Design an enzyme around this catalytic site. Structure first.
Site, mmCIF file in Angstrom:
data_model
loop_
_atom_site.group_PDB
_atom_site.id
_atom_site.type_symbol
_atom_site.label_atom_id
_atom_site.label_comp_id
_atom_site.label_asym_id
_atom_site.label_seq_id
_atom_site.Cartn_x
_atom_site.Cartn_y
_atom_site.Cartn_z
ATOM 1 N N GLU A 160 9.243 -45.868 0.174
ATOM 2 C CA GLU A 160 10.550 -45.229 0.424
ATOM 3 C C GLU A 160 11.444 -45.162 -0.808
ATOM 4 O O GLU A 160 12.031 -44.093 -1.079
ATOM 5 C CB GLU A 160 11.321 -45.968 1.529
ATOM 6 C CG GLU A 160 10.890 -45.750 2.980
ATOM 7 C CD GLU A 160 11.142 -44.356 3.510
ATOM 8 O OE1 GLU A 160 11.645 -43.462 2.849
ATOM 9 O OE2 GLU A 160 10.779 -44.211 4.691
ATOM 10 N N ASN A 197 19.165 -34.804 2.368
ATOM 11 C CA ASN A 197 18.269 -33.990 3.221
ATOM 12 C C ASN A 197 18.872 -32.598 3.453
ATOM 13 O O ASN A 197 20.074 -32.409 3.245
ATOM 14 C CB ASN A 197 17.954 -34.717 4.524
ATOM 15 C CG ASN A 197 17.175 -35.990 4.218
ATOM 16 O OD1 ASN A 197 17.613 -37.089 4.581
ATOM 17 N ND2 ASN A 197 16.055 -35.880 3.517
ATOM 18 N N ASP A 201 19.389 -31.100 6.090
ATOM 19 C CA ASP A 201 20.288 -31.253 7.243
ATOM 20 C C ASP A 201 21.667 -31.872 6.972
ATOM 21 O O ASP A 201 22.430 -32.065 7.953
ATOM 22 C CB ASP A 201 19.486 -32.064 8.287
ATOM 23 C CG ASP A 201 19.529 -33.566 8.061
ATOM 24 O OD1 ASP A 201 19.870 -34.053 6.971
ATOM 25 O OD2 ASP A 201 19.226 -34.286 9.041
ATOM 26 N N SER A 254 22.282 -34.878 5.846
ATOM 27 C CA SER A 254 22.194 -36.354 5.846
ATOM 28 C C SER A 254 21.632 -36.769 4.483
ATOM 29 O O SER A 254 21.068 -35.991 3.718
ATOM 30 C CB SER A 254 21.354 -36.865 6.991
ATOM 31 O OG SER A 254 19.983 -36.568 6.733
ATOM 32 N N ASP A 275 19.638 -40.376 2.653
ATOM 33 C CA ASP A 275 18.914 -41.641 2.844
ATOM 34 C C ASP A 275 19.420 -42.611 1.761
ATOM 35 O O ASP A 275 19.519 -42.272 0.591
ATOM 36 C CB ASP A 275 17.401 -41.541 2.796
ATOM 37 C CG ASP A 275 16.922 -40.463 3.784
ATOM 38 O OD1 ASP A 275 17.425 -40.343 4.899
ATOM 39 O OD2 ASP A 275 16.001 -39.763 3.360
ATOM 40 N N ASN A 316 18.958 -43.534 6.955
ATOM 41 C CA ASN A 316 19.558 -42.205 7.132
ATOM 42 C C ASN A 316 20.940 -42.220 7.767
ATOM 43 O O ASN A 316 21.207 -42.912 8.761
ATOM 44 C CB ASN A 316 18.528 -41.337 7.904
ATOM 45 C CG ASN A 316 19.021 -39.891 8.007
ATOM 46 O OD1 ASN A 316 19.704 -39.504 8.983
ATOM 47 N ND2 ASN A 316 18.662 -39.148 6.957
HETATM 48 C C1 LIG Z 1 10.936 -36.291 6.933
HETATM 49 C C2 LIG Z 1 12.445 -36.230 6.846
HETATM 50 O O1 LIG Z 1 13.249 -35.245 6.659
HETATM 51 N N1 LIG Z 1 13.242 -37.264 6.987
HETATM 52 C C3 LIG Z 1 13.183 -38.528 6.752
HETATM 53 C C4 LIG Z 1 14.007 -39.050 7.980
HETATM 54 O O2 LIG Z 1 13.357 -38.532 9.152
HETATM 55 C C5 LIG Z 1 14.027 -40.586 7.940
HETATM 56 O O3 LIG Z 1 15.197 -40.869 8.751
HETATM 57 C C6 LIG Z 1 14.631 -40.939 10.026
HETATM 58 O O4 LIG Z 1 15.214 -39.782 10.616
HETATM 59 C C7 LIG Z 1 14.717 -39.697 11.984
HETATM 60 C C8 LIG Z 1 15.019 -38.302 12.424
HETATM 61 O O5 LIG Z 1 16.451 -38.177 12.580
HETATM 62 C C9 LIG Z 1 15.382 -40.798 12.789
HETATM 63 O O6 LIG Z 1 14.933 -40.822 14.137
HETATM 64 C C10 LIG Z 1 15.900 -40.755 15.133
HETATM 65 O O7 LIG Z 1 16.359 -42.049 15.350
HETATM 66 C C11 LIG Z 1 17.318 -42.173 16.418
HETATM 67 C C12 LIG Z 1 17.720 -43.595 16.424
HETATM 68 O O8 LIG Z 1 16.688 -44.475 16.761
HETATM 69 C C13 LIG Z 1 16.678 -41.781 17.757
HETATM 70 O O9 LIG Z 1 17.663 -41.713 18.788
HETATM 71 C C14 LIG Z 1 17.337 -42.805 19.615
HETATM 72 O O10 LIG Z 1 16.414 -42.213 20.538
HETATM 73 C C15 LIG Z 1 15.892 -43.277 21.411
HETATM 74 C C16 LIG Z 1 14.767 -42.660 22.189
HETATM 75 O O11 LIG Z 1 15.292 -41.589 23.026
HETATM 76 C C17 LIG Z 1 17.025 -43.637 22.387
HETATM 77 O O12 LIG Z 1 16.647 -44.824 23.151
HETATM 78 C C18 LIG Z 1 18.186 -44.126 21.540
HETATM 79 O O13 LIG Z 1 19.320 -44.228 22.434
HETATM 80 C C19 LIG Z 1 18.593 -43.059 20.457
HETATM 81 N N2 LIG Z 1 19.378 -44.254 19.545
HETATM 82 C C20 LIG Z 1 20.531 -43.845 18.986
HETATM 83 C C21 LIG Z 1 21.130 -45.123 18.408
HETATM 84 O O14 LIG Z 1 20.886 -42.612 18.919
HETATM 85 C C22 LIG Z 1 16.091 -40.379 17.635
HETATM 86 O O15 LIG Z 1 15.330 -40.156 18.823
HETATM 87 C C23 LIG Z 1 15.152 -40.316 16.393
HETATM 88 N N3 LIG Z 1 14.605 -38.935 16.222
HETATM 89 C C24 LIG Z 1 13.283 -38.754 16.163
HETATM 90 C C25 LIG Z 1 12.868 -37.303 16.225
HETATM 91 O O16 LIG Z 1 12.399 -39.638 16.049
HETATM 92 C C26 LIG Z 1 15.077 -42.174 12.163
HETATM 93 O O17 LIG Z 1 15.905 -43.126 12.790
HETATM 94 C C27 LIG Z 1 15.369 -42.161 10.639
HETATM 95 N N4 LIG Z 1 14.987 -43.397 9.997
HETATM 96 C C28 LIG Z 1 15.720 -44.199 9.242
HETATM 97 C C29 LIG Z 1 15.017 -45.368 8.601
HETATM 98 O O18 LIG Z 1 16.914 -43.979 9.048
HETATM 99 C C30 LIG Z 1 14.338 -41.223 6.565
HETATM 100 C C31 LIG Z 1 13.750 -42.600 6.498
HETATM 101 O O19 LIG Z 1 12.312 -42.564 6.586
HETATM 102 O O20 LIG Z 1 13.748 -40.480 5.466
HETATM 103 C C32 LIG Z 1 13.621 -39.109 5.425
HETATM 104 O O21 LIG Z 1 14.823 -38.459 5.018
#
Ligand SMILES: CC(=O)N[C@@H]1[C@@H](O)[C@H](O[C@@H]2O[C@H](CO)[C@@H](O[C@@H]3O[C@H](CO)[C@@H](O[C@@H]4O[C@H](CO)[C@@H](O)[C@H](O)[C@H]4NC(C)=O)[C@H](O)[C@H]3NC(C)=O)[C@H](O)[C@H]2NC(C)=O)[C@@H](CO)O[C@@H]1O
Length: 129
Positions: free
Chosen positions: A35, A46, A48, A50, A52, A59
């Site tokens: 990372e 990003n 979008d 956002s 990191d 993020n």
């Molecule tokens: C490849 C690229 O462009 N980007 C990566 C980037 O993806 C990485 O950051 C990651 O981004 C993803 C996409 O936004 C994040 O995933 C989301 O995370 C949230 C929080 O966990 C999820 O919402 C949760 O959903 C669960 C299931 O429904 C619910 O129970 C929770 O209530 C809801 N929680 C909250 C608190 O909202 C959401 O579903 C995820 N989306 C997806 C499609 O998976 C991920 O968290 C994020 N990671 C980090 C470490 O920040 C980033 C890091 O690898 O790098 C690149 O820019």
């Protein structure tokens, strides 16, 4: 700060990351390496709007406030700037919160890509931890 691999492994172990939410230490060292190359000051914008932040590249859409991200939720309840310090306390606290969500460590793209299913022994080899 740019951490040395074993230096980081020791700081993570000291902070209770070994086995946190069932993720052994090597998992955390591997994701940090891919990372951010172990740089606490790493930043990546990003498409979008956002950004990191830090060693774990957390993020700004969901976890921290950077004041310029559209539709941000700030779940760790911190400024993203706190994720860039040499001191890992806040970053670790927020990484712990991230892995509790349903997707677990799969939240990290670099983990899914370079660490998942791999032999990670090498990431902690020679650290004496
Ligand atoms: C490849 C690229 O462009 N980007 C990566 C980037 O993806 C990485 O950051 C990651 O981004 C993803 C996409 O936004 C994040 O995933 C989301 O995370 C949230 C929080 O966990 C999820 O919402 C949760 O959903 C669960 C299931 O429904 C619910 O129970 C929770 O209530 C809801 N929680 C909250 C608190 O909202 C959401 O579903 C995820 N989306 C997806 C499609 O998976 C991920 O968290 C994020 N990671 C980090 C470490 O920040 C980033 C890091 O690898 O790098 C690149 O820019």
């Amino acid at each position: 700060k740019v951490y040395d691999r074993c230096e980081l492994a020791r700081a993570l172990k000291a902070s209770g990351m070994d086995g946190y939410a069932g993720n052994s230490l090597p998992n955390w060292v591997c994701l940090s390496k891919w990372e951010s190359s172990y740089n606490t000051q790493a930043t990546n914008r990003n498409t979008d709007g956002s950004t990191d932040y830090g060693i774990f590249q957390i993020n700004s859409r969901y976890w921290c406030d950077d004041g310029r991200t559209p539709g941000a939720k700030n779940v760790c309840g911190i400024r993203c700037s706190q994720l860039l310090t040499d001191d890992l306390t806040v970053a670790i606290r927020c990484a712990k919160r991230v892995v509790l969500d349903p997707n677990g460590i799969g939240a990290w793209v670099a983990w899914r890509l370079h660490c998942q299913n791999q032999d990670l022994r090498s990431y902690v080899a020679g650290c004496g931890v």
